[PDB]
Short mmCIF file of C-alpha atoms in Angstrom, two decimals:
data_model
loop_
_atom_site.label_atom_id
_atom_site.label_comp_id
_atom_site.label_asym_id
_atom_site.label_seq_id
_atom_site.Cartn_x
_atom_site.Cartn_y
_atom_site.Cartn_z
CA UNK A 1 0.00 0.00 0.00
CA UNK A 2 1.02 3.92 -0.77
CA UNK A 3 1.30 5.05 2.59
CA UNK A 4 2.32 8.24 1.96
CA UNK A 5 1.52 10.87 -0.50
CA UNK A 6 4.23 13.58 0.64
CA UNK A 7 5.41 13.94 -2.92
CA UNK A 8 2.12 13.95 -4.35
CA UNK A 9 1.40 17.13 -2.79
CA UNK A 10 4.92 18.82 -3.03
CA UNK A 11 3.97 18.61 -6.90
CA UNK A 12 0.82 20.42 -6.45
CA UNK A 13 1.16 22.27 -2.80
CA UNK A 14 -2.44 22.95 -2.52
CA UNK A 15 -2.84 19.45 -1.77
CA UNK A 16 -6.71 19.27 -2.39
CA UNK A 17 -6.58 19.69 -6.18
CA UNK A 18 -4.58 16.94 -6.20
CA UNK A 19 -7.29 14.81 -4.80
CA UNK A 20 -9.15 16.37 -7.67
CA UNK A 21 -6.78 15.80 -10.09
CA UNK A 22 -6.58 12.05 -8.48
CA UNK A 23 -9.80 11.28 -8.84
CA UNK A 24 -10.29 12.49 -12.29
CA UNK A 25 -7.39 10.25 -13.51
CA UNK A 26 -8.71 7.21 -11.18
CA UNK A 27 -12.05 7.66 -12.82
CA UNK A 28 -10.80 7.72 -16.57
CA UNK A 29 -8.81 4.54 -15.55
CA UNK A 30 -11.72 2.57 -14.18
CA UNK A 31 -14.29 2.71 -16.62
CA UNK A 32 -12.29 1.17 -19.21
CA UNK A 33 -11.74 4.81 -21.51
CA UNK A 34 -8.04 4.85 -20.85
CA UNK A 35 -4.41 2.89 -20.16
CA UNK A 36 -2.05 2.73 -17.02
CA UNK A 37 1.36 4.89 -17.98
CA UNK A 38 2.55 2.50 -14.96
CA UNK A 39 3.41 -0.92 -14.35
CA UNK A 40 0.36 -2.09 -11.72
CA UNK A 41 1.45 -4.15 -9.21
CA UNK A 42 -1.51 -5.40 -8.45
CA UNK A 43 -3.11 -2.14 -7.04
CA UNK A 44 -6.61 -0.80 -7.00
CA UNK A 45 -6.99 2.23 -9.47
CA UNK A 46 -6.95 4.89 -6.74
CA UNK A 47 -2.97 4.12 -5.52
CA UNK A 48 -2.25 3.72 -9.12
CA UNK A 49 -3.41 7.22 -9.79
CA UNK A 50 -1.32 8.65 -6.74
CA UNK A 51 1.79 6.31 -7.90
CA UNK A 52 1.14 7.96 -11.59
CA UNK A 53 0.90 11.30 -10.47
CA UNK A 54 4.14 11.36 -7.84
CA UNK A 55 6.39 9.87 -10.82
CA UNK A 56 5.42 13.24 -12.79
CA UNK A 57 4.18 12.05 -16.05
CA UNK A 58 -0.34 13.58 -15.25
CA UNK A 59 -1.10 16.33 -13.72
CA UNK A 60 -4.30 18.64 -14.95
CA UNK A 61 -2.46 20.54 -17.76
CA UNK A 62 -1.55 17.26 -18.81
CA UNK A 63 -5.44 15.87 -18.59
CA UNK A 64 -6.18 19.02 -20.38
CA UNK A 65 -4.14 18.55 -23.85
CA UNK A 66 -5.01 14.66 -24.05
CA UNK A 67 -8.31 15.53 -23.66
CA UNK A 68 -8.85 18.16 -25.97
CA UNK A 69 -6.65 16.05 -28.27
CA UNK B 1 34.89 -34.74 13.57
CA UNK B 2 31.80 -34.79 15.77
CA UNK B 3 29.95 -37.08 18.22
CA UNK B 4 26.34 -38.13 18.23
CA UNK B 5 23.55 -39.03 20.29
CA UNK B 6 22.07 -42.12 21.23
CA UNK B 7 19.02 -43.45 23.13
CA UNK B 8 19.86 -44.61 26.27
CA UNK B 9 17.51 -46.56 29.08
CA UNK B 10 13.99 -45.43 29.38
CA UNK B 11 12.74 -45.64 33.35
CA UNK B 12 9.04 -46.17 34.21
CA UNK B 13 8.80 -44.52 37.04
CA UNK B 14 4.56 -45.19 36.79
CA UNK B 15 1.94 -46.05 33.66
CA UNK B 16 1.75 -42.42 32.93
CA UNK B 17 5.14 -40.93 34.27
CA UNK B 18 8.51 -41.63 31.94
CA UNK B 19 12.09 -40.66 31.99
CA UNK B 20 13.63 -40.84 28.47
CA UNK B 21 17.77 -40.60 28.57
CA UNK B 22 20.05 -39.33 25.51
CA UNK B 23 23.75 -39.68 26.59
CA UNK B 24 26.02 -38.42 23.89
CA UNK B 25 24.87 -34.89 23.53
CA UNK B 26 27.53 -31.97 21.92
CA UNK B 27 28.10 -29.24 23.54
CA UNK B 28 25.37 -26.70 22.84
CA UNK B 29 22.43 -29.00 21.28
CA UNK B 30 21.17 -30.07 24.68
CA UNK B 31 18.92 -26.79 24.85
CA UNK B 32 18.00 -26.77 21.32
CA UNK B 33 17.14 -30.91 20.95
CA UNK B 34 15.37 -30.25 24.40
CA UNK B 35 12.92 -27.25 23.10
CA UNK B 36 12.30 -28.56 19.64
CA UNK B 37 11.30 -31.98 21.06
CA UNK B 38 8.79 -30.70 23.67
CA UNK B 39 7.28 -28.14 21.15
CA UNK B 40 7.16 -30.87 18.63
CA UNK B 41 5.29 -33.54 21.51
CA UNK B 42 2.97 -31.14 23.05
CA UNK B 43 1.97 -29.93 19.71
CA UNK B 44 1.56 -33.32 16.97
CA UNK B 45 0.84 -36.24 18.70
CA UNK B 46 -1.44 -38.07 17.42
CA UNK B 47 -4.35 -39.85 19.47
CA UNK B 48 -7.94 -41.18 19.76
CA UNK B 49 -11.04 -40.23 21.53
CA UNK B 50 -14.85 -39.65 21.84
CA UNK B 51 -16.55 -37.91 18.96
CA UNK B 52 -20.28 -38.52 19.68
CA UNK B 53 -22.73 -40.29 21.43
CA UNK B 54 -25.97 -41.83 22.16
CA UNK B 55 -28.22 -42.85 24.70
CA UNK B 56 -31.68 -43.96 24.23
CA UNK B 57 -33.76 -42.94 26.32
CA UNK B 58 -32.30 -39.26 26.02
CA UNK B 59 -33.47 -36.68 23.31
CA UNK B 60 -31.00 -34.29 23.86
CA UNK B 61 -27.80 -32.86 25.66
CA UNK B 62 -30.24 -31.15 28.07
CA UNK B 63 -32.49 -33.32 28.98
CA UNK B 64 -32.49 -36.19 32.19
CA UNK B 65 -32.78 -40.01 32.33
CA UNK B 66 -34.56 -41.63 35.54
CA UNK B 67 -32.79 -43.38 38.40
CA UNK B 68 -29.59 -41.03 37.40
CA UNK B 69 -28.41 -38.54 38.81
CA UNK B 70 -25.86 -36.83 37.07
CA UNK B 71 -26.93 -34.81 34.03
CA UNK B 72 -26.72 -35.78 30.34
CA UNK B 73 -24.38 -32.93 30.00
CA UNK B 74 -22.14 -34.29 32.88
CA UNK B 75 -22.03 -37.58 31.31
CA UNK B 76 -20.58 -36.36 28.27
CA UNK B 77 -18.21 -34.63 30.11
CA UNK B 78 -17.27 -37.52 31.85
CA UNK B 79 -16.68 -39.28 28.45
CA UNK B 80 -14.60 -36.96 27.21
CA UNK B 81 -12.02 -37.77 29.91
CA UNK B 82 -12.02 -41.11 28.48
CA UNK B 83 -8.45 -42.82 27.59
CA UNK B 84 -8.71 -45.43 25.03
CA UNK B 85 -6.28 -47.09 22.81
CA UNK B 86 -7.42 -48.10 19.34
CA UNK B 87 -5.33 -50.48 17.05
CA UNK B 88 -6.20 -51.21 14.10
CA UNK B 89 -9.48 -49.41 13.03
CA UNK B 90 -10.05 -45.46 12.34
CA UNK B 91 -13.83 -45.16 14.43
CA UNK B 92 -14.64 -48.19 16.55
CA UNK B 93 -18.03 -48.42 18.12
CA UNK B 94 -18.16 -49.17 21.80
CA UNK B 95 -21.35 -50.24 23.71
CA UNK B 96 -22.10 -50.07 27.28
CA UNK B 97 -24.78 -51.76 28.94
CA UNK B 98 -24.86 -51.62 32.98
CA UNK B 99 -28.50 -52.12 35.33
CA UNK B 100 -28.92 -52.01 38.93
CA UNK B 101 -27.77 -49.85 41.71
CA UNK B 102 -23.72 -48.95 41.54
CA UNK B 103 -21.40 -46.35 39.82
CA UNK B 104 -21.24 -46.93 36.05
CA UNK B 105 -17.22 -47.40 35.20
CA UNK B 106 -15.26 -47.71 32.15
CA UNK B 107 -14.37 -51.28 32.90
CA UNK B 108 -17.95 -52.37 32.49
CA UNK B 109 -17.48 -51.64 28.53
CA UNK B 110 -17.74 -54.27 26.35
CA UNK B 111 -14.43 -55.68 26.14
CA UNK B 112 -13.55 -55.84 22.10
CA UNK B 113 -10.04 -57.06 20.97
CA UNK B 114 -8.63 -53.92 19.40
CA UNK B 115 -9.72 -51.40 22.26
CA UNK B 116 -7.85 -51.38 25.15
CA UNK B 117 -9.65 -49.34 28.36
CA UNK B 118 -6.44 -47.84 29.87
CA UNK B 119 -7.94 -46.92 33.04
CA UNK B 120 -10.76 -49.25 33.90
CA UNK B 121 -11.97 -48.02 37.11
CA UNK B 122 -12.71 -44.28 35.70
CA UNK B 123 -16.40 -43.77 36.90
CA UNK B 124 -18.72 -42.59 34.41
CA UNK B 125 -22.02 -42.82 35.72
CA UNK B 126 -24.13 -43.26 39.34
CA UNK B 127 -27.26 -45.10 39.46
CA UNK B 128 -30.21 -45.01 42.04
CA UNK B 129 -32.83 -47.54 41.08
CA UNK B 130 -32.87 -51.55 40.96
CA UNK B 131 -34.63 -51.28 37.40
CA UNK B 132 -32.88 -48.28 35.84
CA UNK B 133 -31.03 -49.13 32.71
CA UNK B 134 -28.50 -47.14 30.94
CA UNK B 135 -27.31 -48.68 27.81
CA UNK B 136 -25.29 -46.21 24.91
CA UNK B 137 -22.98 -46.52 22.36
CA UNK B 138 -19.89 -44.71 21.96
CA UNK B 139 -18.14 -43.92 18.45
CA UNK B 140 -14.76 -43.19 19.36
CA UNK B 141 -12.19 -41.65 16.10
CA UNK B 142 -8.38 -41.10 15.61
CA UNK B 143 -6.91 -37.42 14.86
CA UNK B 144 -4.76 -34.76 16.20
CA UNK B 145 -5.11 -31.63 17.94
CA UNK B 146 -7.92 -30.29 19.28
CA UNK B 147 -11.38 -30.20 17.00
CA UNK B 148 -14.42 -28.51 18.56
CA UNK B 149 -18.49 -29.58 17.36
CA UNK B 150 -19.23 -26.01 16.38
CA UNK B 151 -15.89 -26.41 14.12
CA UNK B 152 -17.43 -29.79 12.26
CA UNK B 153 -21.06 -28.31 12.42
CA UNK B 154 -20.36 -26.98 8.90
CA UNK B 155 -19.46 -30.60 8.00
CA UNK B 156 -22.92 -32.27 9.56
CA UNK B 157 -23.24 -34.93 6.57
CA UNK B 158 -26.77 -35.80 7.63
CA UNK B 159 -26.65 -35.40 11.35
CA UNK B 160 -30.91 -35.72 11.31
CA UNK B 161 -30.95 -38.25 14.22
CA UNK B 162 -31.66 -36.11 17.19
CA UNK B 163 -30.07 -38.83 19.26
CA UNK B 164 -26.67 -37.87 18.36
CA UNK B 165 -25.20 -35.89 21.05
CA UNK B 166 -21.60 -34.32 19.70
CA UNK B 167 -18.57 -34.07 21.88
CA UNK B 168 -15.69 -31.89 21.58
CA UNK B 169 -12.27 -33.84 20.91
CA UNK B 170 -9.08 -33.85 22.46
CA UNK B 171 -7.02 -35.79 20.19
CA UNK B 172 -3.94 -35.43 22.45
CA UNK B 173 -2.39 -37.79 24.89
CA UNK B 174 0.45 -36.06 26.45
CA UNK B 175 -0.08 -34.02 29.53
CA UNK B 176 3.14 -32.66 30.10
CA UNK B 177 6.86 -32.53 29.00
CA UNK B 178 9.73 -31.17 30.38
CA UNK B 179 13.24 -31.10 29.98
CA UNK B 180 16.93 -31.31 32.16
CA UNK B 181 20.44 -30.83 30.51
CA UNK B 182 22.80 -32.02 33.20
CA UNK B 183 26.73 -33.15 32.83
CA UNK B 184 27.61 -36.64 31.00
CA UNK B 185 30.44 -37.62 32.20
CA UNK B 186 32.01 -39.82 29.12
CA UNK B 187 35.01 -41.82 30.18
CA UNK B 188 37.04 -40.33 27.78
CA UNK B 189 35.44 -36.32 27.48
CA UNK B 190 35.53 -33.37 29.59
CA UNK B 191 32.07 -31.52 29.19
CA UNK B 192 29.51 -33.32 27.33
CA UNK B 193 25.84 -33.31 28.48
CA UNK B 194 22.98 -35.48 28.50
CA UNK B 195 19.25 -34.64 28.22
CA UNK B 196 16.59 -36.26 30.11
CA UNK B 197 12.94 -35.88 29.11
CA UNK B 198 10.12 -36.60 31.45
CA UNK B 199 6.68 -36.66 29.85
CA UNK B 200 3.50 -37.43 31.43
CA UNK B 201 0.99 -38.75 29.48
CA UNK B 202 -2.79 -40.56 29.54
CA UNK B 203 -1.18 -43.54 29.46
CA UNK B 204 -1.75 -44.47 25.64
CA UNK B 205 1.38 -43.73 23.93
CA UNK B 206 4.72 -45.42 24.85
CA UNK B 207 7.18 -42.95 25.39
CA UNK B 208 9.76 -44.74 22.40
CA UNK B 209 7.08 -44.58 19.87
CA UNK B 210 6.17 -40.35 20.87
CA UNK B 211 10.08 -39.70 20.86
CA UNK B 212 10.42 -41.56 17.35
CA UNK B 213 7.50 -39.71 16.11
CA UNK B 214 8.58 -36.52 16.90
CA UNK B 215 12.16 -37.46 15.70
CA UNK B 216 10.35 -38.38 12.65
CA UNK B 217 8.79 -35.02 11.84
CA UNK B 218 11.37 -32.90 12.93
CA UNK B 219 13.65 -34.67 10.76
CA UNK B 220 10.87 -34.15 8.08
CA UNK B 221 11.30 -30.27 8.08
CA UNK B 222 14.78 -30.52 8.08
CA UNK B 223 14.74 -32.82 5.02
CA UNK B 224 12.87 -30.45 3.28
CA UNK B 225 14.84 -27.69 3.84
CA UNK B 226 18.04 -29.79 2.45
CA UNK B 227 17.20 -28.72 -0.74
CA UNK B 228 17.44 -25.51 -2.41
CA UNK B 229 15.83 -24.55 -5.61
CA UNK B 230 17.04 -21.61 -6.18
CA UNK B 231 15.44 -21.77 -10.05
CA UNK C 1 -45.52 23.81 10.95
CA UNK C 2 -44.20 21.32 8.04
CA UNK C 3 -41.13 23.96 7.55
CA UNK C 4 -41.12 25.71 10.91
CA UNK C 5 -39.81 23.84 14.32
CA UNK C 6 -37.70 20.89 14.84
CA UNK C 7 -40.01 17.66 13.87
CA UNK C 8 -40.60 19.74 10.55
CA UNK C 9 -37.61 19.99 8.50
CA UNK C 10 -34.27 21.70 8.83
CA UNK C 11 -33.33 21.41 12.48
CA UNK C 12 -33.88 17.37 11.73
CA UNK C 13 -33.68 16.66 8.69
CA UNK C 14 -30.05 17.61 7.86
CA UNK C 15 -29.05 17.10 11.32
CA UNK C 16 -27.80 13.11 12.57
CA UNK C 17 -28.95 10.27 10.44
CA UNK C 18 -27.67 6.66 10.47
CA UNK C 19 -25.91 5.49 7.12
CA UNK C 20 -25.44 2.31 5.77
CA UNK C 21 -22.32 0.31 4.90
CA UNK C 22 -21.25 0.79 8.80
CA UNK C 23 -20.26 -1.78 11.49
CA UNK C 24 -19.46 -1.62 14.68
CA UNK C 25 -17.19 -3.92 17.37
CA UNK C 26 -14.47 -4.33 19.92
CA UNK C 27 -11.57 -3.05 19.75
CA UNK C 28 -8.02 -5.57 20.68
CA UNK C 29 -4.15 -5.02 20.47
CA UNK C 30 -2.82 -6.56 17.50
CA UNK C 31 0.67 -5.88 17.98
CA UNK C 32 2.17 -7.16 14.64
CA UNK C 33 0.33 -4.78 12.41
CA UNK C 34 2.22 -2.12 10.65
CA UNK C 35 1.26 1.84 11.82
CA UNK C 36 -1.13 2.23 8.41
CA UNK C 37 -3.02 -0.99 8.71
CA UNK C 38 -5.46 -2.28 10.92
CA UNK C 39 -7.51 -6.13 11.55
CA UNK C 40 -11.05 -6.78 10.22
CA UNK C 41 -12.72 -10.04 11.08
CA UNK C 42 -13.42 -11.54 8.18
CA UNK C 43 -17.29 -11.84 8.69
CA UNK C 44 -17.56 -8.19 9.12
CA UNK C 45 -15.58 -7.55 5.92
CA UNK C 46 -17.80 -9.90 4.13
CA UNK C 47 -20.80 -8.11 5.22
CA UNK C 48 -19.98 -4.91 4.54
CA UNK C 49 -18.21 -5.47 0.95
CA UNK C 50 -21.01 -7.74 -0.12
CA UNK C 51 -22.05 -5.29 -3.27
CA UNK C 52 -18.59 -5.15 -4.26
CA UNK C 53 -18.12 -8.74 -3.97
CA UNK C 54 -21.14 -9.69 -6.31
CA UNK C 55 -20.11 -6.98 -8.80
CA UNK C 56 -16.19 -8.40 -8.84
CA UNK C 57 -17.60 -12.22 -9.03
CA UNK C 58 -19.70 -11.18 -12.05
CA UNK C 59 -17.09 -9.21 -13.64
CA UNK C 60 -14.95 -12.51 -13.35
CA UNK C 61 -17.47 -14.68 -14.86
CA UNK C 62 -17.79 -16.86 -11.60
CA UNK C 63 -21.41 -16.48 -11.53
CA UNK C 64 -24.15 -15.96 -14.55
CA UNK C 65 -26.38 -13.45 -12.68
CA UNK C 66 -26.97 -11.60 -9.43
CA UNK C 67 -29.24 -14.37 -7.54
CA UNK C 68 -26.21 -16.76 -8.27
CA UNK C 69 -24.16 -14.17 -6.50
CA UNK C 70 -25.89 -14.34 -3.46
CA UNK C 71 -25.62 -17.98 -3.42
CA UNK C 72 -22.25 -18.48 -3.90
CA UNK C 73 -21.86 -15.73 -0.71
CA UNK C 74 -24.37 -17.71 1.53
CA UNK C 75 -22.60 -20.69 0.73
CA UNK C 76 -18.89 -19.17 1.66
CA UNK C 77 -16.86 -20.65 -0.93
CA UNK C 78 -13.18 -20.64 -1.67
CA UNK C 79 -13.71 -18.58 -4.50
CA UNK C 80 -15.85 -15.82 -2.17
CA UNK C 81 -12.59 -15.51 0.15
CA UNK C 82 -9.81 -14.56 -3.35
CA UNK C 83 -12.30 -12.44 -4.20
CA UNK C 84 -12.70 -10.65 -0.94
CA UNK C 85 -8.97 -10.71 -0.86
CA UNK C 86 -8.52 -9.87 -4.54
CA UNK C 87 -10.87 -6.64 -3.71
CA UNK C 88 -9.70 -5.41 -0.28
CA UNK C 89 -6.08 -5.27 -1.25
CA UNK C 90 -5.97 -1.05 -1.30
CA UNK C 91 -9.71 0.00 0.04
CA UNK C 92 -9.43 1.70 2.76
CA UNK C 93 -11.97 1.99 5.82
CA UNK C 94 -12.80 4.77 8.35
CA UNK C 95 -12.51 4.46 11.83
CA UNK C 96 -14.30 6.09 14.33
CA UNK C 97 -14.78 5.74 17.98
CA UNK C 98 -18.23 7.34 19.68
CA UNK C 99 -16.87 10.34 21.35
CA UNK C 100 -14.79 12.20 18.43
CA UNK C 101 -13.29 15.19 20.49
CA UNK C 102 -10.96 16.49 17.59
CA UNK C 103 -9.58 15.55 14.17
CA UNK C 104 -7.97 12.20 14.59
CA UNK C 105 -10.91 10.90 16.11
CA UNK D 1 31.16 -16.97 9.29
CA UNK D 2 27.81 -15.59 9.88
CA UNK D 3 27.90 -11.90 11.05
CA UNK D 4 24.15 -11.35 11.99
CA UNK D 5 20.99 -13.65 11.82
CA UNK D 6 17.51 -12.84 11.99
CA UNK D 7 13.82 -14.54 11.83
CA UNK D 8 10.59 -13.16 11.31
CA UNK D 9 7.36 -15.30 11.81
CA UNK D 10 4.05 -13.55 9.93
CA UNK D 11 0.54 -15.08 9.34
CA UNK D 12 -0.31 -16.88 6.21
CA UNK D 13 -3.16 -18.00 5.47
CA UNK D 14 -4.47 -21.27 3.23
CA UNK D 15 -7.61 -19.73 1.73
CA UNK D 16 -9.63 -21.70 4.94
CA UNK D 17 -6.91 -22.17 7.45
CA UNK D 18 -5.46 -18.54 8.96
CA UNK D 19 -3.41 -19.73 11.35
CA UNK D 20 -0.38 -20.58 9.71
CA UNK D 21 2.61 -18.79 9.59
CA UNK D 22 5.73 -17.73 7.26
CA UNK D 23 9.18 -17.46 8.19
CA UNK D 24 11.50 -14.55 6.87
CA UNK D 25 15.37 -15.48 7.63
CA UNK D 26 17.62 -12.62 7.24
CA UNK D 27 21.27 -13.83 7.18
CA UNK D 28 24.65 -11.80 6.81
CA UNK D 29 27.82 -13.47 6.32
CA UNK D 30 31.20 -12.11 6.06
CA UNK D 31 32.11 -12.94 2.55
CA UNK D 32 33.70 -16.77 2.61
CA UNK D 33 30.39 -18.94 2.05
CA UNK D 34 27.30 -17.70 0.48
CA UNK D 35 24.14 -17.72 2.69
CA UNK D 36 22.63 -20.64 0.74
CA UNK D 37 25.38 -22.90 1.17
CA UNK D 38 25.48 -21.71 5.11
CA UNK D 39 22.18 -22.76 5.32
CA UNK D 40 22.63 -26.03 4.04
CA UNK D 41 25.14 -26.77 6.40
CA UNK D 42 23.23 -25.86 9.07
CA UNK D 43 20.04 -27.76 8.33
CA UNK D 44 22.38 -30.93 7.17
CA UNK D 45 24.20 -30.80 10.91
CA UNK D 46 20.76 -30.36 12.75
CA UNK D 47 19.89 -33.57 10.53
CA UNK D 48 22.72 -35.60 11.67
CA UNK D 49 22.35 -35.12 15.24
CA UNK D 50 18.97 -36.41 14.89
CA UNK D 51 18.95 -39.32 12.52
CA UNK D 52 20.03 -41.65 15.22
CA UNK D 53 16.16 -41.66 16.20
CA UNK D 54 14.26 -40.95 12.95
CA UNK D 55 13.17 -44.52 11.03
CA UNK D 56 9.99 -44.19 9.94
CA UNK D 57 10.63 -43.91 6.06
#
């Protein structure tokens, strides 16, 4: 388990949008619209959101452009 | 370059209490042959006992027969204390039949060749009236451990006969085990040790056959952990 | 008198209801856990994750249609308990005890 | 040759049974046998003491 999301929130240091942001990501990875950019290791979509978003590659800009894409 | 142990004289002090001897012992294994051998004993061995009964006249646990007068419930508990040793079969059926006035004993079972009643004067039963009758029949099983009825309820394979009155089973004979590392003097040695194991038990299992056992599945582990896979 | 007073409206009802999906038990030591995990009997968890536990089983194909679901859960089957596993792995549950004076209540 | 030695003992459970356990040996040596081969050792000398009793095969 992900027991910590320190780095999660020194990328976005409001540290609410990022549940935002989170959840967003989570929820375009459940219902089967898009791919994990990460290796799962056997996690449940929510820690493999936070694991996504602390190795950099979403954030909302980024949700932004692939969507509008 | 080492030495090894080997089983030395086995005093009977009583039926139940035993002294088991192992000369030879290196330096430093006393402790460790000591522990390992009472965990494996107290935990593994295997033994037989009481799953269920019934009496006739009796529709359940709860209820009370005439001309007795310990409960139903009591009975069973007496059973349960019951030390039996099976030989050849897995569940042997055991009937007792006793009338008249007197205490109801384990002795008044009907002798069959393959069980042998350990302790036959263990009391089971009182009764108070010339023509009260108890007659029941006792399935007794082989296993390990310690199996409770709620445990096997989920198992009840057509238990409809409200007869059948369930007993909790404590497939374990030994009692107690403990263990003394004390100096071997070898003719020809200056500090080796030798371990002496007293067990008391029920008075089922020989005290060669529960070391060997235990030998057995200790060696077992060990033979499994001999190999390495590695792959 | 519908919107006015306390048995009305307002001052009830938006004010302390019970919800569903809750349990409650004893609490014991359970020294071996790590500092962000916590036991669950496993009859509790069942109970609660039910829903979840019919929607995972007919995801996985075990069972053909809802009433089958709740079969295969009465019953308790091996297949009930990898699921239950297969599902809990990073859910996380709340915990609350009856006086919460602050926060980490 | 071992420098430090270690066991944890964790629950594991067999889908029914949930008390059963797993053990975790941590082993350092100081370079001249790997652990593997330290282990085997050990379990083979344990063995030897007790095979003077062991005969049900």
């Amino acid at each position: 388990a992900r027991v910590t999301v320190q780095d999660a929130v020194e990328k976005i240091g409001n540290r609410f949008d990022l549940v935002l942001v989170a959840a967003r990501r989570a929820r375009q990875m459940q219902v089967g619209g898009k791919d994990p950019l990460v290796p799962e290791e056997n996690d449940k979509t929510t820690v493999i959101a936070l694991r996504e978003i602390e190795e950099g590659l979403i954030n909302n800009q980024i949700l932004d452009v692939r969507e509008r894409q | 370059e080492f030495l090894k142990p080997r089983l030395v004289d086995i005093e009977q002090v009583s039926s139940t209490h035993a002294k088991v001897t192992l000369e030879p012992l290196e330096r430093g294994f006393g402790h460790t042959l000591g522990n390992a051998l009472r965990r494996i004993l107290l935990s593994s061995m295997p033994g037989c006992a009481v799953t269920e009964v019934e009496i006739d006249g009796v529709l359940h646990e709860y209820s009370t027969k005439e001309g007795v007068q310990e409960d139903i419930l009591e009975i069973l508990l007496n059973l349960k204390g019951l030390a039996v040793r099976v030989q050849g079969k897995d569940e042997v059926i055991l009937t007792l039949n006793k009338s008249g006035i007197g205490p109801v004993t384990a002795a008044d079972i009907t002798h069959d060749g393959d069980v042998e009643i350990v302790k036959p004067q263990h009391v089971i039963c009182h009764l108070t009236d010339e023509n009260a009758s108890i007659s029941m029949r006792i399935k007794v099983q082989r296993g390990r451990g310690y199996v409770p009825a709620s445990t096997r309820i989920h198992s009840e394979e057509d238990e409809r006969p409200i007869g059948r009155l369930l007993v909790d089973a404590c497939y374990s004979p030994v009692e107690r085990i403990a263990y003394n590392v004390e100096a071997a003097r070898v003719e020809q040695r200056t500090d080796l040790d030798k371990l002496v194991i007293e067990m008391e038990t029920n008075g089922t299992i020989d005290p060669e056959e529960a070391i060997r056992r235990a030998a057995t599945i200790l060696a077992e582990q060990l033979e499994a952990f001999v190999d390495l896979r590695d792959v | 008198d519908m919107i006015k007073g306390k048995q009305g409206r307002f001052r009830q009802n938006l004010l302390g209801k019970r919800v569903d999906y809750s349990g409650r038990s004893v609490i014991t030591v359970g020294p071996y856990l790590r500092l962000h995990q916590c036991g669950l009997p496993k009859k509790m968890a069942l109970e609660l994750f039910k829903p979840f536990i019919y929607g995972k089983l007919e995801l996985r194909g075990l069972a053909t249609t809802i009433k089958a679901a709740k079969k295969m859960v009465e019953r308790e089957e091996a297949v009930v308990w990898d699921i239950l596993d297969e599902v809990i792995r990073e859910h996380p549950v709340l915990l609350n005890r009856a006086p919460t004076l602050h926060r980490l209540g």
